[PDB]
From Swiss-Prot:
Keywords of the record: Calcium, Digestion, Disulfide bond, Hydrolase, Metal-binding, Protease, Secreted, Serine protease, Signal, Zymogen
One Gene Ontology cellular component annotation held by this UniProt entry: serine protease inhibitor complex
Organism of this sequence: Bos taurus
Classification via Pfam families: Trypsin (PF00089)
Protein name as catalogued: Serine protease 1
PTM comment: Subsequent cleavage after Lys-125 leads to alpha-trypsin. Further cleavage after Lys-170 yields pseudotrypsin. A cleavage may also occur after Arg-99.
Cofactor comment text: Binds 1 Ca(2+) ion per subunit.
Methyltransferase is among the record's keywords: no
Subunit relationships: Interacts with SERPINA1.
EC assignment: 3.4.21.4
Matching InterPro entries: Peptidase_S1_PA, Peptidase_S1_PA_chymotrypsin, Peptidase_S1A, Serine_Proteases_S1, Trypsin_dom, TRYPSIN_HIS, TRYPSIN_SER
Amino acid sequence: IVGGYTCGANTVPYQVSLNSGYHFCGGSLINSQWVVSAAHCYKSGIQVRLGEDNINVVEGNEQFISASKSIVHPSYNSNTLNNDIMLIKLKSAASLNSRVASISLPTSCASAGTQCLISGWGNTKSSGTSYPDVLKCLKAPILSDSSCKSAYPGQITSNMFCAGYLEGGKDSCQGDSGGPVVCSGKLQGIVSWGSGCAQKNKPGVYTKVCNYVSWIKQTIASN
Ligand SMILES: NC(=[NH2+])c1ccc2[nH]c(-c3cc(OC(F)(F)F)ccc3[O-])nc2c1
Ligand SMILES: [Ca+2]
Ligand SMILES: [Cl-]
């Protein structure tokens, strides 16, 4: 997260860290045995780490659970990143409390201007790499479709939305991929891609979760 702030320990209880010997992506806990992340974060050997704040120190509240399986959207396109969403089922269910909790899926899409919270352990420099130990947060608004398409002509599909600041300086970045974009208590986006991090007129692009709720429900109901 570039231009963000320290969230504070366990203030974002649905945030998870996907780990393979190091943190490589974020994700969101939606029920005690399922996590939602981005399809481009897919790899084998994933351990899901819940209740984290400093990812390099065991401080208490952490639950490390292995992934039993990851389900990448069948229409995911790695070249356009269209349908960039993945579901991860946990080997055991997580113990939910106030430090570990799931987030609700939306019943309707969010509109432009909605203020959301983006969090993650990704890079904090727009020019270079500084990876934080603790969770960083950024409050950002959803932009209009016209400004988003004007910023990335021919690259935005109906399953994507832009959120951020056109003046540059505040944005999600590499390492934040797969994590949550929460607006009014509902998971509306997943960190997907952007051109560099916090560059002027190059906002972040997020997977539009309201377009996948029946797919998430049907897939969880059959696995
Ligand atoms: N500007 C943004 N809002 C943004 C957000 C997530 C990103 N994730 C990545 C990303 C970049 C990668 O390429 C690199 F390793 F060459 F930096 C790889 C994975 C990523 O998720 N870039 C990103 C940019
Ligand atoms: Ca820790
Ligand atoms: Cl276009």
